[PDB]
């Protein structure tokens with residue numbers, strides 16, 4: 001007997017990377033579904049009994065410890081921001097607008113630029129800060145983009161803002177998480193030349209060595225470096241998820257396990 | 262010499278609860294401002310050198326540990342939700358709308374209700390879950406309301422869902438944070454009868470003992486208890502802030518210290 005598309009989709013929802021189950025092995029849908037429901041119930045029961053931590057929250061906490069311990073100040077800035085923060089940043093069709101003059105932030109950079117400028121009046125060189133939190137863009141497009149995702153951005157301004165120090169921070173960070181990567185040359189319209197941090201064909205991060213001409217519009221007038229990483233992409237690599245939706249804030253998956261059981 | 266309103270406001274921005282400084286003591290504005298700028302720079306320098314943790318993030322982590330250790334599953338659910346989640350919940354003019362069919366969640370309850378229903382199919386009784394994260398309402402109105410604030414909601418469904426267990430969890434929680442409180446009877450249009458958790462005239466939490474008639478609309482069909490707390494109000498009490506804006510996500514204050522230095 002052959003599986004319908006609806007049946008295959010249901011089994012794919014219930015399958016996890018650790019399974020070694022063939023959906024097209026001739027076993028009827030009913031037995032594959034019952035087997036996978038039992039395994040996923042067991043998996044959630046184990047999480048509930050023994051760990052109880054959300055993957056996104058736990059990764060945020062692990063990242064926070066890494067950067068606080070290396071001298072970076074932890075920032076929590078608004079998610080709902082002025083629409084004016086563009087074209088002050090220079091996408092475009094991807095912005096979720098809110099009322100008339102606001103939007104959901106698509107990136108952390110504008111608030112962090114404001115903090116770098118302000119903190120440089122008070123703190124010793126170099127200024128090192130980071131933020132982790134939700135960002136929003138109109139794009140889902142399958143297995144690597146979410147509309148609601150979680151960004152880490154760290155940055156430094158003053159001394160030590162060289163390409164080699166930027167690459168060394170990225171290397172120490174991804175070594176800490178156990179993720180292999182390479183660095184490639186890329187570009188974008190906001191920052192210009194970028195380094196891209198790649199895991200295979202998956203972009204984990206865009207990183208920048210300043211100064212860039214945009215600095216003047218933000219009152220930034222010292223060398224700087226910084227990088228942005230999406231946490232759901234990190235989780236996708238760490239847990240070998242086929243689709244990034246497994247990693248997202250959602251009511252449909254808990255730690256990559258279907259909640260429809 | 263007398264201070265203008267603009268001068269008093271500037272000094273109030275720079276004053277912190279720990280100061281014992283009189284703004285109307287006859288000293289000129291210039292010397293009060295210079296003294297307070299020096300103290301606040303020192304304060305930020307100390308944070309940068311020795312702790313580097315954001316107050317909201319650190320409190321989120323402390324709360325997360327408290328509830329995970331007591332058997333509650335940590336949830337991270339979407340912040341951008343369907344507008345349909347009302348009037349399915351039953352405010353009203355306070356919702357930030359996004360595009361046509363979405364809004365910024367004003368509360369955590371609908372996503373947590375969905376998780377309780379789903380998890381009860383997989384997990385043993387009782388089901389215990391919680392979430393911490395941003396919520397949004399159109400109201401600032403001074404010293405106790407923010408438009409972007411951070412909610413803790415914990416809840417339990419099944420056995421043990423009594424008023425006395427709810428009060429005991431609240432008591433253990435606020436004792437852990439070192440915050441005195443009392444419980445009063447209140448009501449609201451969404452849940453009906455509520456307990457209010459009060460610190461003086463400041464509402465820290467609204468809590469509910471189910472079942473309530475709204476349960477049927479969410480597929481909830483067991484006893485339940487739950488409570489919501491605003492983290493910025495907890496921080497306001499803990500740090501004796503005069504205005505809740507000191508506690509909020511912001512680019513204008515870092516851990517209650519003005520960033521305009």
Ligand SMILES: Nc1ncnc2c1ncn2[C@@H]1O[C@H](COP(=O)(O)OP(=O)(O)OP(=O)(O)O)[C@@H](O)[C@H]1O
Nearest residue numbers: 137139144145146149203204205206228229230233
């Ligand atoms: N829609 C999205 N969903 C999930 N993660 C994202 C999304 N957009 C960006 N990220 C993450 O944020 C990082 C920095 O993002 P940037 O601001 O450079 O976006 P990006 O270059 O458009 O990413 P991509 O080229 O894959 O669309 C990316 O490398 C990725 O890890």
Ligand SMILES: Nc1ncnc2c1ncn2[C@@H]1O[C@H](COP(=O)(O)OP(=O)(O)OP(=O)(O)O)[C@@H](O)[C@H]1O
Nearest residue numbers: 398400405406407410464465466467489490491494
């Ligand atoms: N605008 C806000 N700013 C900051 N915290 C809030 C806000 N609204 C609610 N909270 C917090 O969330 C808790 C639960 O909120 P609920 O959903 O009961 O709101 P609420 O009863 O309108 O609060 P209040 O009566 O003070 O307006 C409150 O007890 C408070 O701690």
Ligand SMILES: C#Cc1cccc(COC(=O)NCCCC[C@H](N)C(=O)O)c1
Nearest residue numbers: 107109112113154155206220226227228
């Ligand atoms: C404008 C501006 C600005 C000026 C100076 C300093 C900062 C600090 O902020 C940063 O760290 N920027 C780097 C983020 C890189 C990823 C980014 N989302 C991208 O689209 O490629 C910002």
Ligand SMILES: C#Cc1cccc(COC(=O)NCCCC[C@H](N)C(=O)O)c1
Nearest residue numbers: 368370373374415416467481487488489
């Ligand atoms: C509908 C529904 C629903 C049904 C069953 C269970 C839950 C679980 O969610 C909860 O814990 N609710 C309690 C929150 C109390 C504070 C609240 N913001 C207020 O406006 O007073 C929700």
Ligand SMILES: [K+]
Nearest residue numbers: 015016017019
């Ligand atoms: K598999």
Ligand SMILES: [K+]
Nearest residue numbers: 148248249339
């Ligand atoms: K999401």
Ligand SMILES: [K+]
Nearest residue numbers: 276277278280
């Ligand atoms: K004071």
Ligand SMILES: [K+]
Nearest residue numbers: 078409509510
């Ligand atoms: K805010």
Ligand SMILES: [Mg+2]
Nearest residue numbers: 091137139145
């Ligand atoms: Mg993109």
Ligand SMILES: [Mg+2]
Nearest residue numbers: 186188203206
């Ligand atoms: Mg790209």
Ligand SMILES: [Mg+2]
Nearest residue numbers: 188203205206
């Ligand atoms: Mg990029």
Ligand SMILES: [Mg+2]
Nearest residue numbers: 352398400406
């Ligand atoms: Mg209210």
Ligand SMILES: [Mg+2]
Nearest residue numbers: 447449464467
């Ligand atoms: Mg109230």
Ligand SMILES: [Mg+2]
Nearest residue numbers: 449464466467
């Ligand atoms: Mg209330």
